[PDB]
Amino acid sequence: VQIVYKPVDLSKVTSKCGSLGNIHHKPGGGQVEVKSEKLDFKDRVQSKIGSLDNITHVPGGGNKKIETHKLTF
Amino acid sequence: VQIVYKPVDLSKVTSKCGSLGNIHHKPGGGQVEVKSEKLDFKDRVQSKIGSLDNITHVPGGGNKKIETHKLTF
Amino acid sequence: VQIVYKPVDLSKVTSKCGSLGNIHHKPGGGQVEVKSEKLDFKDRVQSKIGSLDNITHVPGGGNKKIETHKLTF
Amino acid sequence: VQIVYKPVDLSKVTSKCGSLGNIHHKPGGGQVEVKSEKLDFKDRVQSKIGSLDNITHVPGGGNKKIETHKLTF
Amino acid sequence: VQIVYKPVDLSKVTSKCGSLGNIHHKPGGGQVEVKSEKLDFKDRVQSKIGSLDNITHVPGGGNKKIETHKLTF
Amino acid sequence: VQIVYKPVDLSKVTSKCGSLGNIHHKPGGGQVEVKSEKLDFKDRVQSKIGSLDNITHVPGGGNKKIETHKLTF
Amino acid sequence: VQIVYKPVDLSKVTSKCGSLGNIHHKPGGGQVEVKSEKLDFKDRVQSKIGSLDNITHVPGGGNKKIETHKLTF
Amino acid sequence: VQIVYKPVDLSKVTSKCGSLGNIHHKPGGGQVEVKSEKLDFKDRVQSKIGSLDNITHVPGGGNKKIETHKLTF
Amino acid sequence: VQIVYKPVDLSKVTSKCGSLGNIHHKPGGGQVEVKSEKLDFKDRVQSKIGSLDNITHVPGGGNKKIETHKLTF
Amino acid sequence: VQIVYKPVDLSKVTSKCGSLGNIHHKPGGGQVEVKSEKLDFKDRVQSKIGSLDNITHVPGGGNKKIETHKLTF
Amino acid sequence: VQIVYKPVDLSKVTSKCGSLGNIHHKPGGGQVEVKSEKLDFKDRVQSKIGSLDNITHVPGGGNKKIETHKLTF
Amino acid sequence: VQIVYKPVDLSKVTSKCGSLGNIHHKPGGGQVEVKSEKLDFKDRVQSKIGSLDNITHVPGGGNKKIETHKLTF
Amino acid sequence: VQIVYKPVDLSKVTSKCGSLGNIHHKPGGGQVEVKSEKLDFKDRVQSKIGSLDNITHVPGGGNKKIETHKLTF
Amino acid sequence: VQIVYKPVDLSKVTSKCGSLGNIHHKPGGGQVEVKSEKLDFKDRVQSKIGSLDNITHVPGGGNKKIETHKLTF
Amino acid sequence: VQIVYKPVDLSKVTSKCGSLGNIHHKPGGGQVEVKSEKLDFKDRVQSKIGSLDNITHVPGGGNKKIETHKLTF
Amino acid sequence: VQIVYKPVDLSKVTSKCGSLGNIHHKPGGGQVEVKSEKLDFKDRVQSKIGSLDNITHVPGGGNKKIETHKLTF
Amino acid sequence: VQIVYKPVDLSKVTSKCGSLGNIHHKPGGGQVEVKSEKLDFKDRVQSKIGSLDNITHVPGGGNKKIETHKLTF
Amino acid sequence: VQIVYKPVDLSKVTSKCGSLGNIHHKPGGGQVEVKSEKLDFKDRVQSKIGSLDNITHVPGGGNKKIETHKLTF
Amino acid sequence: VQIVYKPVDLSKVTSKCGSLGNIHHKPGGGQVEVKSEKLDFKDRVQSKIGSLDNITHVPGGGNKKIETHKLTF
Amino acid sequence: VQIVYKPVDLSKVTSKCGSLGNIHHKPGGGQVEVKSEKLDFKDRVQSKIGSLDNITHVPGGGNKKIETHKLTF
Amino acid sequence: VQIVYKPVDLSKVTSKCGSLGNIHHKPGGGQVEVKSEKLDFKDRVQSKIGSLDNITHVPGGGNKKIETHKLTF
Amino acid sequence: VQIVYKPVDLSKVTSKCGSLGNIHHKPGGGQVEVKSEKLDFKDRVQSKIGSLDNITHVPGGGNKKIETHKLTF
Amino acid sequence: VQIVYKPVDLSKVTSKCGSLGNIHHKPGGGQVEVKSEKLDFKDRVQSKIGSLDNITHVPGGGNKKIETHKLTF
Ligand SMILES: FCCC1CCN(c2ccn3c(n2)nc2ccccc23)CC1
Ligand SMILES: FCCC1CCN(c2ccn3c(n2)nc2ccccc23)CC1
Ligand SMILES: FCCC1CCN(c2ccn3c(n2)nc2ccccc23)CC1
Ligand SMILES: FCCC1CCN(c2ccn3c(n2)nc2ccccc23)CC1
Ligand SMILES: FCCC1CCN(c2ccn3c(n2)nc2ccccc23)CC1
Ligand SMILES: FCCC1CCN(c2ccn3c(n2)nc2ccccc23)CC1
Ligand SMILES: FCCC1CCN(c2ccn3c(n2)nc2ccccc23)CC1
Ligand SMILES: FCCC1CCN(c2ccn3c(n2)nc2ccccc23)CC1
Ligand SMILES: FCCC1CCN(c2ccn3c(n2)nc2ccccc23)CC1
Ligand SMILES: FCCC1CCN(c2ccn3c(n2)nc2ccccc23)CC1
Ligand SMILES: FCCC1CCN(c2ccn3c(n2)nc2ccccc23)CC1
Ligand SMILES: FCCC1CCN(c2ccn3c(n2)nc2ccccc23)CC1
Ligand SMILES: FCCC1CCN(c2ccn3c(n2)nc2ccccc23)CC1
Ligand SMILES: FCCC1CCN(c2ccn3c(n2)nc2ccccc23)CC1
Ligand SMILES: FCCC1CCN(c2ccn3c(n2)nc2ccccc23)CC1
Ligand SMILES: FCCC1CCN(c2ccn3c(n2)nc2ccccc23)CC1
């Protein structure tokens, strides 16, 4: 039995910008209320219970390249 | 038995912009109310219970290239 | 038995823009109410129970290229 | 037995724009009410129970190219 | 037995625009009410129970090219 | 036995526009009420129970090209 | 046995427009009421129970080209 | 039995920007309230119960390249 | 039995920027309240109960390259 | 039995910036209150109960390269 | 049985910056209150109960390269 | 000259009801448009130009008694 | 000259009700548009230009008694 | 000359109710637009230009008694 | 000349209620827009230009008694 | 000349209630926009330009008695 | 000339209530925008330009008695 | 000439209540924006330009008695 | 000439309450922005330009009695 | 000429309360911004420009009695 | 000429309370920004420019009695 | 000419309280910024420019009695 | 000419309290910044420029009685 695995990749994820500019993020605070009694979490459970979050993500150049090579017998 | 795997990729995910400009995000805070009794989470469960979230994602250049190579016997 | 797998790809996902401009996002906060008793989640379940979320996604250049190569015996 | 797999692709998903312009998103907050008793989720179930969400997606250049190569024996 | 698979593709999904212009989205918040007792979800079920959502998708250049190559024995 | 599969495609899905213009979307919020008791969903069921949604999709250049190549033995 | 499959396609789905213009969408919110008791969904069933939705789809250039190549033995 | 695994990658995730500009993040503090009785967490569970968080992520140049090579016998 | 594992990688995750600029982060302090009785955490559980956190991450040049090589017998 | 493991990597995670600029972080102190009775932590549990934290991370040049080589018999 | 393990790495995590600039961090002191009764910690548990912490991390040049080589029999 | 004015009134405007009951008012929002150029109002003029009004007047007991006594010389 | 004015009134405007009941007012928001150029109001003029108003007046007991006594020489 | 003015009034505007009940007012927000150029108001003019108002007046006991005594020479 | 003015009033504006009950006022926020150029107000003019107001007036016992005694020579 | 002014008043504006009850006021925030150029106000003019106001007036016992005695020569 | 002014008043504005109850006021924050150029106010002018105000007036016992005695020669 | 002024008043503005109860006021912060150029105020002008105010006035016993005695020659 | 002024007043503004109760005021901080150029105030002008104020006025017993006696020659 | 001024007042502004109770005032800090150029104040002008103020006025017994006696020749 | 001025006052502004109770004032610090150029104040002008003030006024017994006696010739 | 001025006052501003109780004032420090250029103050002008002040005024017994006697010729 | 001035006052401003109790004042330090260039103060001007002050005024018995007697010729 013979196996060959030679994937070739040559990619350019380019990102050119002159100038983003004046970005404003002025949220008004709200109100959040959560009421529970019992929590039982197991086996890779990620939770977010009760949140008032503000994020201003302004990256000059945003590029994500994902490659998942796999091989099984 | 013989196997060959030589996928060739040559791609340019280009992104050109002169200038984004004046971006404004001025939300007014609302109200959220959640009421529960029991929670039972298992086996890769991700939850978001109660949220008032504001996000201003302004990346100059947004490009995501996903490649999933697989091979099984 | 002989197998050959040589897919060739050469693609340019171009994106040219002069200037986005003045983008405004001024939402008025509403009201959300959720009432439950019992939750039982399992086996790759993602939930969003109760949310008042505002997002302003303004990426200069948006391009996503997905390739899923597979091969099984 | 002999197998050959040489798909050739050469595509340009072009996107040219001079300037988007003045985009405004001014929603008025409404009201949402959800009432349940029991939830039982399993086996790749994604839910959204109770939401008042506003999104302003303004990407300069929007282009998604999907290719799903498969081969089975 | 002999098999050959050489599909050739050469396509240009062009998109040219001078300027989008002044786009306005000013919805008035309504009211939504959902009342249930029991939920039982399984095996690739995605639900949206109770929503008041506003989206302003204004991408300069919108082009999606889908190719699904398959081959089975 | 011999098999040949060489489909050739060369297509240009062009889209030219000078300027979209002033687009306005000013809906008045209505009222929605849904009342149920039991839900039992299985095997690739996607539902939308209770919604008051407004969308303003204004892409400069809208072009989708779908190709589904298949081959079975 | 011999098989040949060489379909040739060369098509231009052109779309030229000078300027769309002033498009207005001003709906008045109505009222919707749905009343049920039991729901049992299975095997690729997609439902929309209770909706008051407004959409303003104004793409400069709308062109969709679908090709379904098939071959079976 | 023979196995070969020589994947070649040569990719440039470029990110060019002239100047980001004046970015402002002025959120108004809201209110969050969470009430529970018992918590039972196990086996890779990460939770966030009660949060009012503001983040201003402005990286000049944002590029993440992920490669997951795997091989099993 | 013979095994070879020679993956070659040559990638440049470049990030060029002229000058970020004047970045301001002026949040207004809110209020957070969490009330529980018993906590039982085990087996790789990370929690964040009660937080009012502000972060201004402004790295000139942000680039993360992840490679996970694996091999099992 | 023979095994070879010679992965070659040659990557440059470059980060060039002219000058970050005037970065300001002026948060207003909020209020946090957490109330519990009993805590029982075990087996790699990291918690953060009650926090009002401000961080201004401004590194000139941010680049993290992670490589996880593994091999098992 | 023979085993070879010769991974070669040659990477330059460069970070160039002209001058960071005037960075200001002027937080306003808030208030934090935590109330508990009993704590029981064991087996690699790190906790942070009650904190009002301010950090200004401004390193000229931030670059972390992690390599985890492993080999087991 | 002699004048006498002694009007005697003794009236009971009774209103008895056991229970009104379940009264529902669920109008569907219409559309109104008024276009004018000049308005000139004087000397006890009350106007209502442009209205979409809903009123649910349910008074338990409705009784109005009007008496206009007058006398002139 | 002699004048006498002795009007006697003895009236009971009674209103008895056991219980009003469940009154519901669920209007759907419409749309109103008014366009004018010049307004000139004088001398006891009350106007209402542009209104979308909902009122639910449910007074237990509604009784108004008006008496206008006058006398002139 | 002689004048006498002795009006006698003895009235009971009674209002009895057992219990109003469950009153609900759930309007859906509409849209109002008013456009003018010049306004000139004088001499006891009260105006309401542009309004979306909701009122729920539920007074237990509503009774207004008006008496206007006048006398002139 | 002789004048006498002895109006006698003896009135009981009674208001009895057992219990109002559960009153709910859940309006959905609409949208209001007013556009003018010049305003000239004089001589007892009260205006309300642009309003989205919600009022829930629930007074236990509502009774207003107005008496306007006048006398002139 | 002789003048007499002896108006006698003896009135009881009673208001009895057992218990108001559970009153809820949950409005959803809308949006208001007013645009003017010049304002000229004089001589007892009270204005309200631009308002989104919510009031919950629940006085146990509401009774206003107005008496305007006047006399002129 | 002789003048007499002896108005007698004996009034009881009573207000009895057992218990108001659970009153809730949970408004959702909206958005207000006012734009003007010049303001010229004189001679007893009170204005309110731009307001988002919430008031919960719950006085146990509300009674206002106004008497305006006047006399002129 | 003779003048007499002996107005007699004997009034009891009573207010009895057993217990107000649980009153809650949880508004969600909105957003207000006012833009002007010149202000010219004179001669008893009180203004409120730009306000987001919340008031919870809960006085046990609210009673205001106003008497304005006047006399002129 | 003779003048007499002997107004007699005997009034009891009573206020009785058993116990107010649990009053809560939990507003969510909004956002206010005011922009002007010139201010010119004179002659008894009181202004409030820019305010985000919260007040919880809970006086046990609220009673204000105003008497304005006047006399002129 | 003779003048007499003997106004008699005998009033009891009583205020009785058993116990106020648990009063809570937990506002969330918002954001205020005021921008002006020139201020010119004269002749009894009191201003408040820029304020984020919280007051909890809880006086046991609130009673203000104002009397303004005047007399002029 | 003769003048007499003998106003008699005998008033008891009583205030009785059993016990105020547990009063809490926990505001969250906001943010205030004021920007001006020139200030010119004269002739009894009191100003407050820029303030974030919290006051908890809890006086057991609050009673203010104001009397302004005046007399002029 | 004769003048008499004998105003008699006999008033008891009583204030009785059993015990105030547990009063807490826990504000969270905010942020204040004021920017000016020139200040010119004259003729009884009191100003407060820039303040973050907390006051807890809890006087057992608060009573202020003001009397302003005046007399002029 | 004769003048008499014999105002008699006999007032008791009483203040009785059993015990104030546990009063706590725990403010969190904020931040204040004031920036000016020139100050010119004259003629009874008192200013407070830049202050972060905390005061806990708890006087057992607070009573201020002000009397301003005046007389002029
Ligand atoms: F289960 C706990 C972890 C989950 C929930 C929290 N995360 C996110 C991530 C992104 N978004 C988001 N939430 N809400 C969003 C609203 C609009 C746009 C993007 C949004 C991470 C995943
Ligand atoms: F089942 C939970 C996940 C589902 C439901 C939520 N998602 C979406 C995505 C898109 N849209 C949407 N909802 N509503 C829409 C209305 C108009 C236009 C687009 C819309 C993701 C899929
Ligand atoms: F089952 C849960 C996931 C489903 C339902 C939600 N999604 C969508 C997507 C698009 N639209 C939509 N809903 N409603 C629409 C109305 C008009 C136009 C487009 C619309 C995603 C699929
Ligand atoms: F369990 C006790 C040890 C834990 C908790 C404390 N640590 C940290 C570390 C980083 N961050 C953080 N906390 N909070 C953050 C908020 C924003 C951004 C970064 C933040 C170390 C890990
Ligand atoms: F000119 C400005 C003042 C006018 C117009 C507004 N008012 C009203 C009052 C009552 N109704 C009404 N409008 N429309 C109605 C429709 C049905 C039933 C009753 C209605 C007060 C008087
Ligand atoms: F000119 C400015 C003042 C006018 C107009 C506004 N007012 C009102 C009052 C009552 N109603 C009303 N408008 N519209 C209504 C619709 C149905 C029922 C009652 C209604 C007060 C008078
Ligand atoms: F000109 C500025 C002052 C005017 C207009 C505003 N006021 C009101 C008062 C009452 N209502 C009202 N408006 N609209 C209403 C709709 C339905 C029912 C009652 C209504 C006070 C008078
Ligand atoms: F001109 C500036 C002063 C005017 C306008 C503002 N005021 C009010 C008062 C009462 N209402 C009202 N507006 N709108 C209303 C809608 C429904 C019911 C009652 C209403 C006070 C008078
Ligand atoms: F001109 C500046 C002063 C005016 C306007 C502000 N005031 C008010 C007072 C009462 N209300 C009101 N506005 N709007 C209202 C809506 C519904 C019910 C009552 C309302 C005081 C008078
Ligand atoms: F011109 C500057 C002074 C004016 C305006 C501010 N004041 C008020 C007073 C009361 N209310 C109000 N505004 N808005 C309100 C809304 C609903 C109910 C009551 C309301 C005092 C008078
Ligand atoms: F011109 C500067 C002085 C004016 C404006 C500020 N004042 C007030 C007073 C009371 N209220 C108010 N504003 N807004 C309110 C909203 C609802 C209820 C009551 C309200 C005092 C008078
Ligand atoms: F011009 C500078 C002096 C003026 C403005 C500041 N003052 C006040 C006083 C009372 N209130 C208020 N403002 N805003 C309020 C909102 C709701 C209720 C009461 C309110 C004192 C008078
Ligand atoms: F011009 C500088 C002096 C003025 C302004 C400052 N003062 C006040 C006084 C009282 N309040 C207030 N401001 N704001 C308030 C908000 C709600 C309730 C009461 C309020 C004193 C007078
Ligand atoms: F011009 C400089 C002197 C002025 C301003 C400062 N003073 C005050 C006094 C009282 N308050 C206040 N400010 N702000 C307040 C907010 C709520 C309640 C009461 C308040 C004294 C007068
Ligand atoms: F101009 C310089 C002298 C002025 C300003 C400083 N003083 C004060 C006095 C009282 N208060 C105050 N400031 N701010 C306050 C906030 C809330 C309550 C009371 C307050 C004395 C007068
Ligand atoms: F101009 C320099 C002298 C002035 C300013 C300083 N003084 C004060 C006095 C009292 N207070 C105050 N400042 N700030 C306060 C805040 C809250 C309550 C009371 C306060 C004395 C007068």
Residue numbers in the entry:
A (entry chain N), B (entry chain L), C (entry chain J), D (entry chain H), E (entry chain F), F (entry chain D), ...: 306 to 378
What do the authors say?
We used cryo–electron microscopy to determine a 2.7 Å structure of AD patient-derived tau paired-helical filaments bound to the PET ligand GTP-1. The protofilaments form the canonical C-shaped cross-β fold found in AD that is comprised of the 3 R and 4 R tau domains (residues 306–378) and interact laterally via the antiparallel PGGGQ motif (residues 332–336). GTP-1 is bound in the cleft comprised of residues 351–360, adjacent to the three-strand β-helix (β5–7) in the protofilament. We identify that each molecule of GTP-1 binds across three β-strands, making direct contacts with Gln351 in strand 1, Gln351 and Lys353 in strand 2, and Ile360 in strand 3, as well as the backbone between Gln351 and Lys353 in strands 1 and 2. Lys353 lies at the base of the concave binding groove, where it forms a bifurcated hydrogen bond with the benzimidazole nitrogen (2.8 Å N–N distance) and the pyrimido nitrogen (3.4 Å) of GTP-1, satisfying the hydrogen bonding potential of the buried polar atoms within the tricyclic aromatic ring. Examining tau PHF:GTP-1, we observe that the GTP-1 heterocycles are situated at an optimal distance for pi-pi stacking (3.3–3.5 Å), and GTP-1 forms an extended assembly scaffolded by the tau filament, reminiscent of supramolecular polymers that are highly cooperative. Rather than binding to a nondescript surface along a uniform β-sheet, the strong geometric and physical complementarity between GTP-1 and this unique cleft likely imparts considerable specificity for AD filaments.
Accumulation of filamentous aggregates of tau protein in the brain is a pathological hallmark of Alzheimer’s disease (AD) and many other neurodegenerative tauopathies. The filaments adopt disease-specific cross-β amyloid conformations that self-propagate and are implicated in neuronal loss. For example, AD filaments are comprised of 3 R and 4 R isoforms and adopt a C-shaped fold, while in Pick’s disease, 3 R tau forms an elongated J-shaped fold, and in corticobasal degeneration (CBD), 4 R tau adopts a four-layered β-strand arrangement.
